[PDB]
Symmetry: C2
Subunit: 348 residues, 2 copies
């Protein structure tokens, strides 16, 4: 595929590295630092490498109009949901310390100028930009000016619209990833369109490519790895009985571990070339390929033909099945017994 | 990808159809028709559509040399294994009837001229050709002359070598599939090279493409489906504690069902295009996209600038974030309150 790569802290990402699973706790903590810690613990104990937050400062994120619009996966205004689940600056700092105290990488998605500036003050190692902000060129300009790598979700946006955000990122000179994404909560399998990842890599040859997913299980992400994806993001919860509008499409510790194991296998199995010679097949080639044999008793002086020659395993005969027709018309230099492999000494 | 398709009996196969899982009982029955029936039952009860056999007539399959060569996954000669597990013509006919009595499709792999002729007499709906015979051009010629579709495994062979077999198949005028395959029992993940499927489809645009697999689990096949594969073949057993050299890489009823369910999800999720507009994202676009707002109180007559304008959710404002910079230099036609969306009536 490609050899693009960059570092998030000490963790390299890209086609030639192990796929990175981003555990998006998001708003799943419902505004409780204690709940967030329980989810951070569950992620740690499951083997997570990265916990991602969402940084919500509602007054800079939304105008008063947001109090009258309802998301497809809720029954109250987006403003109410965000004001309910937002952690304040003091608590988010503690959350980052807690994640890092567990040896994991902390990143977050700013949904506003104020949030981006908060995260720059905390000095996070990379920035996630959500699909809603993929076309927020002013906010992308700000985040790119921080000089850290950017992971950009691309849901709800065309290649043409994405080109403008990538132009800004390239101008700031930071490496970046593009996550294919579909922003329906939850997303039907039929809307995932894994082919969109190929479209992104074709259009943006310098991007690390991955998938942000909101389906009900791991299949989409496993397919993303088979296609060459390097970053996988799903929401994460410690328990599936938690309340919250994103819980239903979340992984838990057990399904995280399943994704991690499947991503490892598919990282190994993906790519490569048909024509590569595999040493381990040699014993099979040696017995499974066919050699030319006599199909009847052939007397000295008789001509070899398609009527007195055939081919049978194994592959150690003087003439392989690929040389079958070249023997036609040759002269038997001695009697040849039916069923015997044709020897170089059998022909004149 | 493509719209190639053909019928195996009443079952259409190809990119636009449900992936077909071939339950390869093979030599797993260890020569016992009773055992083969138990495996056919297990496949039926698990939901299998196709049971595939192997047709071994050892005298036409192997010369005496085969009694001295040992496969990588056994400790006796290939001749001994095949003579031990082969079903005679009477038993194979009963096996085909039994499979069909269960509503499933019966196909088989001939390893010899005599076996191919036996299967033509039984009138099977399609022929599998194993990777060992992919370069057995004489045998392919014979099988292609039967006028039934061919499913050709391509392990241990180059594209160049495969082109000669496909030429023969095309000349006979039958539709065909190409299964990418690696013939190590079992196959390490790192040797699967799922990219080989892309190589085959590029070289042979008229082929239905799939995977024949000998890994220890379903990951390779699930990746094959994500990449567009239409046919999946794994060995199949009723129970994993059965003896036999291929049992260890076999699926059983539970892992068959898991593959069937994963292949369904990935058939739905695969392919497609990034730029497709998804109706279900519309509610999210409506609240998640940003509109232009006043970043400070702006007095009538003042000019709009990057210093007194910003952007915030939701997306119902008169000016979207993509129009942000076009407002620069416009004149406020009235006082504009900090935080308000910019209205078309706010500018001269
Ligand atoms: Mg999300
Ligand atoms: Mg096999």
């Amino acid at each position: 595929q490609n050899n693009n790569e960059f570092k998030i802290g000490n963790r390299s990402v890209g086609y030639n590295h192990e796929p990175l699973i981003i555990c998006e706790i998001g708003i799943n903590h419902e505004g409780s630092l204690k709940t967030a810690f329980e989810m951070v613990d569950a992620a740690y104990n499951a083997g997570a490498e990265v916990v991602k937050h969402q940084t919500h400062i509602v007054e800079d994120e939304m105008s008063d109009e947001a109090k009258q619009v309802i998301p497809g996966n809720a029954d109250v205004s987006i403003y109410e949901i965000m004001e309910r689940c937002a952690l304040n600056e003091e608590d988010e700092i503690k959350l980052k310390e807690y994640v890092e105290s567990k040896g994991m990488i902390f990143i977050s998605t700013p949904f506003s100028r104020a949030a981006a500036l908060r995260l720059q003050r905390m000095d996070i190692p990379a920035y996630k930009i959500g699909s809603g902000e993929c076309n927020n060129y002013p906010l992308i300009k700000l985040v790119a000016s921080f000089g850290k790598p950017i992971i950009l979700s691309t849901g709800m946006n065309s290649i043409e619209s994405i080109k403008k955000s990538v132009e800004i990122i390239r101008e700031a000179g930071v490496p970046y990833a593009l996550l294919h994404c579909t922003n329906i909560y939850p997303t039907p399998y039929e809307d995932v369109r894994l082919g969109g990842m190929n479209d992104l890599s074709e259009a943006f040859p310098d991007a690390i490519i991955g998938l942000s997913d909101h389906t009900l299980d791991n299949y989409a992400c496993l397919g993303a790895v088979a296609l060459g994806g390097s970053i996988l993001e799903r929401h994460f919860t410690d328990r599936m009985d938690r309340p919250g509008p994103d819980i239903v499409c979340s992984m838990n510790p057990d399904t995280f571990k399943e994704l991690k194991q499947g991503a490892h296998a598919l990282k190994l199995a993906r790519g490569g070339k048909k024509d590569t010679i595999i040493a381990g097949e040699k014993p099979t080639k040696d017995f499974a390929f066919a050699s030319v044999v006599a199909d009847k008793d052939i007397k000295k002086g008789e001509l070899l033909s398609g009527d007195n020659l055939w081919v049978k395993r194994p592959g150690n005969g003087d003439f392989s099945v690929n040389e079958y027709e070249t023997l036609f018309g040759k002269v038997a230099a001695c009697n040849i017994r039916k069923g015997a492999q044709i020897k170089k000494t059998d022909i004149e």
